[PDB]
């Protein structure tokens, strides 16, 4: 490979970061770090307050982007998602929230952390006390824009006009726009809602989005009625959006961009049509849900960033259908298409339950079913090659593939899929405006040690040396290396014998070759990726280390508390990460 400059490292099970020879890692920032001058220190006992957590780096850091600081080669901003929190570590009692203050403290953990980093003696470090440092959390005041802003379904007792919402939370992954803004994606937002009525009736749209009376072991609703569907059912509609943040304006109000649709958003992959309009590819991470694409009405104004204020409020949302492909077991290839989600088109109208375009967007999942989108094996991150524009999407796994309604075929080639696969497409004419594409499975993950010579052994670019499961995050670097991050089963047993802890790998898009680059600590997943502009630092997240009680990473104090961290990975010889020595 021209691209892969390091030797594939062994799988590992240690409570450490493992890297190739000549590489090193440092903690950039961890959950609980105060952001502001004289801010409250992290308290490992759990006794930190909600108010303190609102001014500290959030928990479970996830997707992130780095923004070059105009005029300053040795400064940058990073916007980093904080997806959820770990009650065993958050509270001294280690259990469910017990009060309104406990619920406020959990909401404080989630959202986005904007931080400044500065380079000193070659190394990037967090700058506490920067005027740019900011928490946006689950109680922050946000705006709603786009076609669904002000709709009846978006109004609540607290917000009678449907344009002002408290919080972004369950922030999974990210996008970075060419007009200098950050997109954060609300994914498992429904988990946070419940009802004081255990026998709560839910309507078909509520059921399709997966709300329950119990909540998903979040249990905010007993103390914060905003999350109690018996009282505030339309609050469910005011989350599940892509939210746009200006990291360079620390007093700006972030905006929920309803034109991009409501669903369990993983990330938001930016591209541009040949005629200059913005394109955002988006996955909905749930078994049997869909892949989407938004194309703006307006051209991006590259020279005048602020002129793009409303660009994500106008345009067209599409959803994918994939054909059956050619059935090749190692490397299936086919065609697919984008289908418009527009009131009055493709059978989307009052007769199929949509009064207007706002409802199409609020209930995008339902609209996409009407038009016959292809049910997918848990779409997670999407990236677009900077070299050739080809688009890659992880399909992390789907244990229910093969069940009635989720047939095996095309880009979902295995029943009871525990390993996942990476889907690629090439938009027609290499124009992201096109409504058709060619697709192929770039890799089918598997375990060829345990399941040699069967579909569970994976595709031929998987070997016993490099094998992994449940690819999730993705990132390209400027050279065109594809970085693959995992959130899989870390048992190192059974179907996963030999795979070890979660990990990051690097792939050559042209050749299909994959090499293991990093292994993370016990109980984590590896998520979030950004590069310095010079490509000599790779920033990567280690999320929920010790989720089941087996880690003290990164500090390794005796009987210590593990902390989600952003790591900085560099070469000892100062060269470009991933490249030859």
Asked whether residue 380 is marked as a ligand-binding residue, the answer is: yes
Q: Which of 110, 359, 477, 487 binds Ca ion (CB under 5 A)?
A: 487
Q: Is 275 flagged in the annotation as binding?
A: no
Looking at the Cβ atoms of 274 and 534, the one nearer to Na ion is 534
What 8-state DSSP symbol labels residue 361? H
Residue from 487, 490, 500, 502 in contact with Li ion (CB under 5 A): 487
What phi and psi, each to the nearest 5 degrees, are found at residue 309? -50, -45
Site residues (CB under 5 A) for Cl ion, limited to 373-392: none
Contact call for residue 267 and Li ion (CB under 5 A): no
Q: Which stretch binds Cl ion (CB under 5 A): 322-330, 394-402, 479-487, 572-580?
A: 322-330
Contact status: 110 vs Li ion (CB under 5 A): no
**Contact flags string 139-178 toward Li ion, x per CB under 5 A:** ---------------------------------x------
Pairing type for strands 141-145 and 255-257 reads parallel
282-321 residues near Cl ion, rule: CB under 5 A: 321
For Cl ion, the binding residue among 43, 298, 310, 323 (CB under 5 A) is: 323
Residue 293: partners with Cβ closer than 8 Å, 6 or more residues away:
279, 280, 281, 282, 317, 318, 319, 320, 338
Q: How many residues does the chain have?
A: 581
CA-nearest of 168, 169, 165, 141 to 154 is 165
Q: What is the rounded CA–CA span in Å between residue 503 and residue 518?
A: 5
Check whether 430 is labelled as a binding-site residue. Answer: no
CB of 441 to Cl ion, least distance (A): 16
| Cα 552–Cα 185–Cα 296 angle in degrees, nearest 5 | 155
Per-residue contact flags (x/-) with Li ion for residues 328 to 357, judged by CB under 5 A: ------------------------------
| Residues found near Na ion in the complex (CB under 5 A) | 522-523, 532-534, 546, 548, 550
336 scored as a contact of Cl ion (CB under 5 A): yes
Segment interacting with Ca ion (CB under 5 A) among 30-38, 444-452, 466-474, 509-517: 466-474
C-alpha distances in Å from residue 277, one per residue of 311, 314, 388, 402, 444: 9, 11, 18, 38, 33
CA distance 411 to 401: 11
Please name which of 493, 496, 490, 505 lies closest in space to residue 543, comparing C-alpha atoms.
490
Binding-site size for Li ion (CB under 5 A) equals 5
With 0-12 / 13-18 / 19 or more C-beta atoms within 10 angstroms meaning exposed / middle / buried, residue 222 is middle
Write the interaction track for Li ion spanning residues 505-534; mark x where CB under 5 A is met and - where it is not: --------------------x-x-------
Cis peptide before 554 (omega within 30 of 0): yes
| DSSP β-bridge partners for residue 316 | 295
Residue 548 contact partner, candidates Na ion, Ca ion, Li ion, none, CB within 5 to 8 A by sort of partner: Na ion
- Which of 200, 273, 337, 434 touches Cl ion (CB under 5 A)? 337
The entry of Na ion, Ca ion, Cl ion, none near residue 472 (CB within 5 to 8 angstroms by kind) is: Ca ion
Measure the CA–CA gap between 189 and 200, rounded to whole angstroms: 18
- Residue span binding Li ion (CB under 5 A) among the ranges 98-106, 225-233, 319-327, 481-489: 481-489
By CB atoms closer than 10 A (0-12, 13-18, 19+), residue 339 is: buried
The distance of closest approach from Cβ of residue 525 to Li ion in the complex, given in angstroms and rounded to an integer, is: 5
Kindly list the residues in this chain that would bind Ca ion in the complex (CB under 5 A): 380, 396, 472, 487
Binding residues for Ca(2+) are 266, 380, 472, 487, 525
């Amino acid at each position: 490979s021209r691209l892969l400059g390091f030797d594939s490292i062994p799988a590992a099970t240690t409570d450490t970061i493992s890297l190739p020879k000549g590489y090193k890692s440092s903690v950039l920032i961890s959950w609980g770090q105060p952001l502001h001058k004289n801010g409250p220190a992290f308290d490992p006992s759990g006794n930190g307050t909600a108010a303190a957590q609102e001014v500290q780096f959030g928990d479970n850091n996830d997707g992130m982007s780095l923004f070059e600081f105009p005029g300053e080669k040795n400064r940058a901003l990073m916007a980093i998602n904080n997806e959820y929190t770990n009650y065993r570590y958050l509270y001294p009692h280690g259990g469910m929230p017990q009060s309104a203050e406990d619920v406020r403290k959990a909401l404080a953990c989630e959202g986005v952390s904007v931080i400044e980093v500065q380079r000193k003696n070659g190394q990037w470090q967090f700058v506490q006390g920067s005027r740019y440092n900011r928490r946006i959390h689950g109680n922050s005041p946000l705006r709603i824009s786009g076609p669904a802003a002000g709709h009846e379904l978006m109004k609540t007792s607290a917000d009678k006009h449907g344009k002002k919402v408290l919080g972004t939370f369950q922030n999974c992954a990210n996008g970075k726009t060419p007009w200098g803004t950050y997109l954060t994606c609300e994914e498992n937002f429904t988990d946070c809602f419940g009802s004081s009525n255990a026998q709560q009736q839910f309507d078909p749209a509520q059921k399709r989005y997966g709300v329950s009376a119990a909540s998903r072991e979040i249990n905010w609703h007993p103390f914060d009625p905003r999350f109690d569907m018996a009282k505030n059912p339309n609050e469910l509609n005011r989350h599940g959006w892509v939210v746009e943040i200006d990291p360079f304006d620390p007093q700006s109000t972030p905006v929920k961009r309803t034109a991009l649709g409501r669903f369990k958003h993983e990330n938001a992959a930016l591209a541009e049509t040949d005629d200059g309009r913005a394109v955002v590819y988006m996955g909905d991470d749930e078994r049997g849900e869909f892949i989407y694409k938004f194309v703006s009405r307006d051209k991006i104004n590259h020279r005048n960033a602020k002129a793009n204020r409303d660009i994500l409020d106008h345009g067209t949302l599409y959803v994918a259908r994939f054909d059956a492909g050619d059935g090749n077991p190692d490397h299936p290839k086919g065609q697919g298409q984008w289908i418009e989600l527009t009131h009055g088109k493709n059978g989307i109208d009052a007769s199929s339950g949509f009064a207007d375009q706002a409802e199409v967007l609020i209930h995008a999942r339902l609209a996409a079913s009407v038009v016959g989108a292809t049910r997918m094996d848990r779409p997670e991150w999407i990236v677009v090659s900077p070299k050739d524009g080809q688009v890659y999407c992880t399909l992390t796994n789907n244990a229910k593939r093969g069940e009635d309604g989720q047939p095996v075929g095309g880009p979902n080639p295995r029943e009871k899929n525990v390993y996942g696969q990476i889907l690629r497409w090439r938009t027609d004419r290499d124009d992201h405006a096109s409504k058709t594409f060619a697709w192929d499975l770039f890799v089918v993950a598997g375990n060829p040690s345990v399941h040699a010579g069967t579909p569970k052994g994976g595709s031929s670019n998987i070997t016993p040396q490099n094998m992994f499961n449940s690819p999730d995050g993705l990132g390209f670097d400027k050279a065109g290396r594809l970085w693959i991050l995992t959130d899989g089963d870390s048992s190192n047993a059974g179907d996963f014998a030999g795979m070890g802890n979660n990990q990051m790998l690097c792939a050559d898009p042209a050749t299909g070759e994959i090499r293991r680059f990093m292994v993370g600590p016990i109980g984590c997943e590896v998520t979030g990726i950004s590069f310095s502009p010079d490509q000599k630092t790779l920033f990567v997240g280690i999320q929920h280390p010790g989720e089941n009680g087996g880690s003290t990473f990164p500090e390794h104090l005796p009987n210590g508390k593990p902390r989600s961290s952003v790591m900085a990975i560099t070469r000892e010889d100062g060269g470009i990460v991933g490249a030859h020595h």
